[PDB]
Amino acid sequence: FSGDGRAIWSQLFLYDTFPKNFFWGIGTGALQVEGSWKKDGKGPSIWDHFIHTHLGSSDSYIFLEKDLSALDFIGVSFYQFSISWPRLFPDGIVTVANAKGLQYYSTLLDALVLRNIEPIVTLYHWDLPLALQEKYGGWKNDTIIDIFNDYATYCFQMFGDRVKYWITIHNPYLVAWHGYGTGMHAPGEKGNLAAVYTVGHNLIKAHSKVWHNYNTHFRPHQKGWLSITLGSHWIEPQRSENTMDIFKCQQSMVSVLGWFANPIHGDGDYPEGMRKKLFSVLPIFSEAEKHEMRGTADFFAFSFGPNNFKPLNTMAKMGQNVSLNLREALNWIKLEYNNPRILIAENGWFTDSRVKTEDTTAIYMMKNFLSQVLQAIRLDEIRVFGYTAWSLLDGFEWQDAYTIRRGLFYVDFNSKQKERKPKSSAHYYKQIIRENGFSLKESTPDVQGQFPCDFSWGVTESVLKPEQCTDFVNIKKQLEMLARMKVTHYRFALDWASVLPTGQLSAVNRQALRYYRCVVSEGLKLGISAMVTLYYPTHAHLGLPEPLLHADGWLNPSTAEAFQAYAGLCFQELGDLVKLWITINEPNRLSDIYNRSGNDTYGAAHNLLVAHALAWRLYDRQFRPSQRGAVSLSLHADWAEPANPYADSHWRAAERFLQFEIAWFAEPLFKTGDYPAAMREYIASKHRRGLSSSALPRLTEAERRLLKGTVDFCALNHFTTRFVMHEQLAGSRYDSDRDIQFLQDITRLSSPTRLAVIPWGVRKLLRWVRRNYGDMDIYITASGIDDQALEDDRLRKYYLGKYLQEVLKAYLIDKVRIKGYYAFKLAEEKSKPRFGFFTSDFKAKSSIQFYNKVISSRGFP
């Protein structure tokens, strides 16, 4: 009831699919798309006169077959369109009907029925016959009520055999408000306060008269439904939870939607606040009229698009903040008007007219709207039963004319043929309808089976600061945590500066080496083997010993020689116990430290590459024969998909992302000893065309021999899948040279820090790795997700189960040589994102038992 909506201003969402029998559609309005404004006896409308005095169409009237083909491509269950009143009755009164206009709409309705497309027909989408404006004053004159009912009666008689869904008026708020308040819409009066509310009143009474007409004379034998399309914006308090601001949001909504919806869907009178403030000009419903206004709509038809947000004077905002939150608007409707059945009769946004077919932003607007609708259905139990995408094709957009585009199909208005070319949004919406929701195409069923008996089950930690072995208190708590898990392997990182404070071996800190040796030997007593990372750089902790840092760090090739000496010391002091080594963690995501220029990023990375290869060759010559372990490095290896999967430039950007992320280091070390060709060619071209000053330095034949073949296995840190689009960026930094922007996909599960849970990404990655680098042994050395929960971490449990299914699918089905999985990470720190299996107070989270269960079963047998 009135006021209940004010409450709206005060887990895991695993739904992709809309209810069975959800009704998918698309809409146009006659003025926007028909053209032929004076062909075949059509009379002029107030918009024809308004365009000709205040301000090449889609030509649907002559290209009806091209529109029907577009509908077939999309695959809608319904098509919403309006009848042009002056095309049927040139003078509005029901004297002789224009025969060619009747034939046009009749042919359209027949063609829809033959294609199994339900028509939804709007009697009035703003094109009042000019003759009625000039003779009577249009909606200002209440003789319009019988004149409009006469027109509707004819339409029920000629078309209602074939039409089961009727809309009387599209968005009456804008007819009154822009037609007579702002002057932005036909007939273009501005400031006429009395007319604004007199017009609103005759629109409401006309609607009600037509409803009773349909209800008594046509519904018994035609068995359809009739409503009216009410539009509104959404709004949020200008101060976050201020009660006076919330009170004003309610008033903003009441003033736009309540004005027409309280009489029709509510108690049958205008809202109380409006009656008081406007008791002046607001006409009065008699008590008999109130009982005849309410309940005159068989469902709630709701419009939510750019006409209720732009221009800025469209609504009284009461000082508050406009918002595109469709989910909240639907909840307000549910509260205010007592849980009605809802058709989304118009929803969409717009682009500039220069956007032709690649409308990425329309896809992401639709993703957001559709995700909000799905939430409203599933979480809020709002009875949305159908959805009208707007609009079918580009047309005339009112005062904006042809400077914006709203179609799912592109139309070149300067060509004679006006061919309807499907935009990206058309392909996307077509797939929405096919899957009745968001695509499952990349998801496969759970597989049954098991990992090898010698699969490495791991957990990861980052840098352990050094503190009998039981002396060190840090070690006790690590053992208590590992003893609660069934891992066979533990990954942790040393602190180079703790081991070698000066960088020189003559000044080794032997206490630090004793601490790390205790971690390993105590772990072995639990039956857990160590994988030891020598160097784990982060944005907060570069990890270099101070004298190397002040000698220019990784821009000084001497830093690589000092790393070789550090590595040898660790092999000597730990390598009888440690058989798995990572030289460097994610050197390819340490381009955030030497971010000055691209040349800096590429130069530092070159020295990191040399560091790794020097340590690897030292190990291979001097320590492998007596120790028989294995050495590699961990590559940051998120997956990438095109943001817009219907834009060829985004498929190229996805492959380019993998080139700059993974092949950058994997090509030299694994395969050729040199940088990937795609990356060097791309940077060169951007340099050749004057846009970047970056060069990827050429590698001597000697340096290529040093680097090639220096890994014993492939180690990958995989967390998520990024969605990427091509964009020519400015500057000569690393992120500029790769020409990539990122989008978040609202339709997928994600974490408090926006990490997307895309389980099939890891399978695609493992294929890409084997396709480009051969049948190497692969370890996933880090995999995980932050989760806000402190004990019942359901997102981590979901992540673990779904990603491990895809790993096992990579193993059983794709035959990838996957040898280990290390979960990230053992414990979280107090004010960092919560990746830990254990809380910062070493409390166990519920995902431990799930991971133990998978380890015990060796998968999902």
Partner: nanobody
């Protein structure tokens, strides 16, 4: 539907009459109410018609300004108020009904007809 006229009769020139047509329908639906008139041996002549909700009314030019057509859907009745009657108005008056809500002026457009009632202006 059956249509039944009444109100005809004999009136002095310059006088006035009110004809009415009551419709009875076994499936009550909307209709256009029409009035035609016929002198003996002459063709049937359009007089006035009215749309279902009364927004459209048409009149023959010989009758504009003198005759007024109206309707009361609750009573299923269409009314013809005839003022300033002339001798040339003497005729049999026929009410007529057309289902499609489109106000037309020729006899073949009307599906249903009353028996007719005599109007005599002496």
């Amino acid at each position: 539907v059956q249509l039944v006229e009444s109100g005809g009769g004999l009136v002095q020139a310059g006088g006035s009459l009110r004809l009415s047509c009551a419709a009875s329908q076994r499936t009550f639906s909307p209709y256009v109410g029409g009035w035609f008139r016929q002198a003996p041996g002459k063709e049937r002549e359009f007089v006035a018609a009215i749309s279902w909700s009364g927004g459209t009314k048409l009149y023959a030019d010989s009758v504009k300004g003198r005759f007024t057509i109206s309707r009361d859907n609750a009573k299923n009745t269409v009314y013809l108020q005839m003022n300033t009657l002339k001798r040339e108005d003497t005729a049999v008056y026929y009410c007529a009904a057309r289902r499609i809500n489109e106000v037309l002026t020729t006899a073949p457009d009307y599906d249903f007809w009353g028996q007719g009632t005599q109007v005599t202006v002496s």
